[PDB]
From TrEMBL, chain C:
The keyword Zinc-finger applies. PANTHER family: 60S RIBOSOMAL PROTEIN L37, RIBOSOMAL PROTEIN L37. Keywords: Metal-binding, Ribonucleoprotein, Ribosomal protein, RNA-binding, rRNA-binding, Zinc, Zinc-finger. GO terms for cellular component: cytosolic large ribosomal subunit. This is Ribosomal protein L37. InterPro entries: Ribosomal_eL37, Ribosomal_eL37/eL43, Ribosomal_eL37_CS, Ribosomal_zn-bd. It comes from Caenorhabditis elegans. It holds the Pfam family Ribosomal_L37e. SUPFAM superfamilies: Zn-binding ribosomal proteins (SSF57829). Component of the large ribosomal subunit. The ribosome is a large ribonucleoprotein complex responsible for the synthesis of proteins in the cell. Binds to the 23S rRNA. PROSITE patterns: RIBOSOMAL_L37E (PS01077).
Automatic annotation (TrEMBL), chain F:
Transmembrane segments: none annotated. InterPro entries: Ribosomal_eL34, Ribosomal_eL34_C_sf, Ribosomal_eL34_CS. It comes from the Eukaryota. This is Large ribosomal subunit protein eL34. The gene is rpl-34. The lineage of its organism: Eukaryota, Metazoa, Ecdysozoa, Nematoda, Chromadorea. GO terms for molecular function: structural constituent of ribosome. Belongs to the eukaryotic ribosomal protein eL34 family. It comes from Caenorhabditis elegans.
Amino acid sequence: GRGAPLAIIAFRDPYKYKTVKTTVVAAEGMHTGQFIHCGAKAQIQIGNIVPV
Amino acid sequence: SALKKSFIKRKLAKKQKQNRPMPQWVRMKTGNTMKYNAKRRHWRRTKLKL
Amino acid sequence: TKGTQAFGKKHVKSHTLCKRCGKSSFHIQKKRCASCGYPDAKKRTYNWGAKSIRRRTTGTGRTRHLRDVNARFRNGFREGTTPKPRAQ
Amino acid sequence: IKRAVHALYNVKAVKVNTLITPLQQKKAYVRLASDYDALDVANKIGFI
Amino acid sequence: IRKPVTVHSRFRAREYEEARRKGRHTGYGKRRGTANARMPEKTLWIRRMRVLRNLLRRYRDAKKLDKHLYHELYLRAKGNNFKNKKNLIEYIFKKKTEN
Amino acid sequence: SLRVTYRRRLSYNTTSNKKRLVKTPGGRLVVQYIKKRGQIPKCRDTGVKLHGITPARPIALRLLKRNERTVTRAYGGCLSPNAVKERITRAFLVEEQKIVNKVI
RNA sequence: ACUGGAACCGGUACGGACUCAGGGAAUCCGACUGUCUAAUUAAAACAGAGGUGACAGAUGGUCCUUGCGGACGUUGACUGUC
RNA sequence: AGGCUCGGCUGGAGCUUCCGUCAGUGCAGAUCGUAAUGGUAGUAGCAAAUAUUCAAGUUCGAUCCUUGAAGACUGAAGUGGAGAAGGGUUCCACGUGAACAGUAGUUGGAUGUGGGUCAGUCGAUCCUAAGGUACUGGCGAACGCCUUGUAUCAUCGGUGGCGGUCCCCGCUUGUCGAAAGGGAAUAGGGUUAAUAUUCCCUAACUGAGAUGCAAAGAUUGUGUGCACAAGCGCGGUAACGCAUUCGAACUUGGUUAGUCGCUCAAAGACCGAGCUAGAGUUUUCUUCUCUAGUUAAGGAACGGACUCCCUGGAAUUGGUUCAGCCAGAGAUGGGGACGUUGUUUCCGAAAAGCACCGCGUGGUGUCUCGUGCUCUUUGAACGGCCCUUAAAACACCAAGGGAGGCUAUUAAUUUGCACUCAAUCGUACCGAUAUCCGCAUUAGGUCUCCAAGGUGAACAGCCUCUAGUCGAUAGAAUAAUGUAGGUAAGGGAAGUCGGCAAACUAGAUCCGUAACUUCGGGAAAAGGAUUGGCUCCAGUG
RNA sequence: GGAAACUCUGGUGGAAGUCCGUAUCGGUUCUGACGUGCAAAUCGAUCGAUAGACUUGGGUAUAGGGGCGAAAGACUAAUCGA
RNA sequence: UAAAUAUCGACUCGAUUGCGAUAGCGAACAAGUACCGUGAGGGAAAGUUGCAAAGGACUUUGAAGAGAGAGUUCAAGAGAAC
């Protein structure tokens, strides 16, 4: 039902021994095995999630 | 159906018991008016709407 | 084709036997009896159904406890006492 | 059924099969151990 | 008594098969399915390719062909240059004499 | 020829009703029901099949011998040998570079 | 196992039964596959892909519910409905 | 006149004059209500699904019931053998006179009397799907409704120590809903009038258990039986193999996921060559035709494409599939590892079943091979397709981790045997031209599995074998009209609103094929030739 | 074959809401049969489709001024402009 | 916060210028029964031997139904559906 592929991304829980999986529409160029940095200090790279 | 429930089977058993000709000696009782079992049921004619 | 041809496909019961009234009016999908309202806590009766009320009202059954209470009331609901000890 | 048969006829049962007849009556087949004789037990009970 | 079953002999079918093997009852007036339906060209091609590839493999194992000539002939066979084993063998013979 | 009939009350060709025709010592052709087949597990990281592991249904896995579910290696039965090799190399090299960066 | 060929033979005939489009030149309508008035209308009717336009950036748009609340919506203009 | 009196017959218990007064107070109709009955009339009719005949049996009585012989039909996408929904005793045996079986009836799904359904392994039971329905909360005059969602929310349970408790770790969620989804584990032979994966015999398997027995743990190295030291296993370069030489909380994974196409393999079915045993045919011919020559679950041992490992370094590029495709990110070659499907001069097991020969319970055999564009089912490996990407839970297993546990002839701990138990409900039969729905024993409808020989491309049409039927009220005769089939001289649409209906064409091989066109088609265009049997020739492994 | 661009020939391959056709699903014509019928919609021949917008069982959801509708006022238990 | 007031729905009673088996309650009787519809629901027909069964022994034809005699009875032409 969606024309855009979804990216399953795994993050490490900062407060407990566990991994958290996130589902989000992939940006063009994102590939499996890539590292996505999310936060205010992340650099300008494709797939990164940063404040505008 | 072959695969049935116990309570359906129990109802069917009671219906089987009920479907039976009247005893002949009842007709000799004093004041008796019944001459036969007037509630006989044939499986093919009248169906139990269970 | 409505009619004889369509009547051959009728082999799935829509109503079954009700636990409360014993009628084959329990809707399987709705899980409710079309006659007495089971499993509703109250009983299904409508004043426009006068004949239905007459059919399903009290006195059409055994009224075992009601008759017992009526019999016991005739002597003031006396309990804990027995007839005078006598013999033949 | 096993316990009742033992307590009523002093006979062990190695197996008990049960069915319910179309008239809603439970019928039990009780196989006695090889030690006991079903024919003798039936003779004693009365049905024979 | 259990009576014997009714006989249903295949003798006529056996004689008909013998005659057909000799080459009878096969003319144009006896065919009702297309040529491909009677004998698929795909099946014929599969048979031919297995035959040619087996021959090439045997020759390479026996050292009658080097890797280069084997590859050339393998690709030619896949390209449908040889009608059958005799054609392939004659071509191999001529090429070997030239070499 | 001989023809068979279903032995159970399920009369539909569902995945739970796969059958096989077998000749019996009595000269009969009967139906024997096929159970589901086990699957070789795959690597956690990659998807390649794992070797040395006996396939079986999940409930039947409890009946095999211990060696039939494991391989004598780290992550044996969970990762492929190449996956373990890659993990070891990555760990060592990443820690070495971390030490170098700390020094710098 | 299938393919091609040759001689000879008969007879009203050889896909000997059986199985299986008659063909062609044009005009009108609908592009096509498809759907429909069960029991008088299977069509040129409906759908259709394609085209255009409208509204909507979510504190939104279109709807339902007596009300609470809910659907599109696990949706976000290459979307949603009309 | 409305009506009344009397007589005769039937009948068996009430009725009546007159005076007042009251009314559910008078029928020919209302396509009036209800019950019954006529002419039509012994009339319409009992005509789809090819078909019956002979002799005998039983009987008061036979087209119809039963036996034998013959002749036909369904023709394996059946008129065969079994199930799901539905039916509910219709199942089986023995009686049957009336009713019913649109003729008949000695027969019956009718009728009267009895009998019949046996489970640890087959299902339900268990898990959740779409979805339903509760809790709170909100709304509602109210019965109650709305949401299944951070709306609501103080919703708990897990290891360990101590012996209820304390430490630590996390954070919250109901409950129903599938005898076609997921799922612990059984097969063969026999037995009944009727039950059979249930009963009997034989042979297994799964789960929950405490106890008992046996074996391990329970040895190694060095030095000289002794001393010291030594943990919780070994082998292989590797893919991995072998034993039983512990291990928690927690975390992360595994447990085919669609559809179509091709190729290959196994089993079953089919088909051949013998050799036995029995039948069939023999004016004549045939080493002839038909039938039987079977091997379950569970084990032991082998086998297994794909994939993986080691060596080594490839252009003059090689390997390779029907098709793909693969290789300096390591090909070819050489040598190895793994594994589901499966196979066996093996156990089960020939003491079974089958076929035949004898006796009044015995005996003989049940054997060697082949074959395939063959089908079904299973398995392996790929390829094509999607603006379509092809469940969820439970449960089991694995790995990382190393909290903990026993202390070198002790112990913890696994291993193998022996033992006990496995509840409840369904289980008969039909499943349709007569057991269901259609008022019925109704040419209708209603979900699936198994599938022989010939001809042939074929599960087409036609014929046949196993199995099953001849059930459709019958006999005579063959007028008119009819319904449904088959023909017709000469002409050939003049018929008719109209070529309606019918006829014409057709399979396969070779040749040939126009306008137009969106270049894909049109196209089987149009239109020609050949086709049998027999005896040979050549090609294709 | 060509200087190149690229072109031609023969195979392999097996795509398509492709075609003929069995099961199956429909119901065009005979305006055939029947029309107090086998049948309150059936029967025969002839016909449309037949690997997908396919045909279907069961479980579920939608209830009357409402539902559902490839749209006929169609269907919503022989009842539908309520 | 009792009484005077309402009410036969329930239990128990007494009456009538009412009906007399198509009437009177749907139901005088195995009546809210048989039967019908998936369901809400719909819903009948059906009183009478004789004082007393004394309900026709026995003979006879027929396989039987049944008939011819006979017997019971005030009466069977009151013989069971009387």
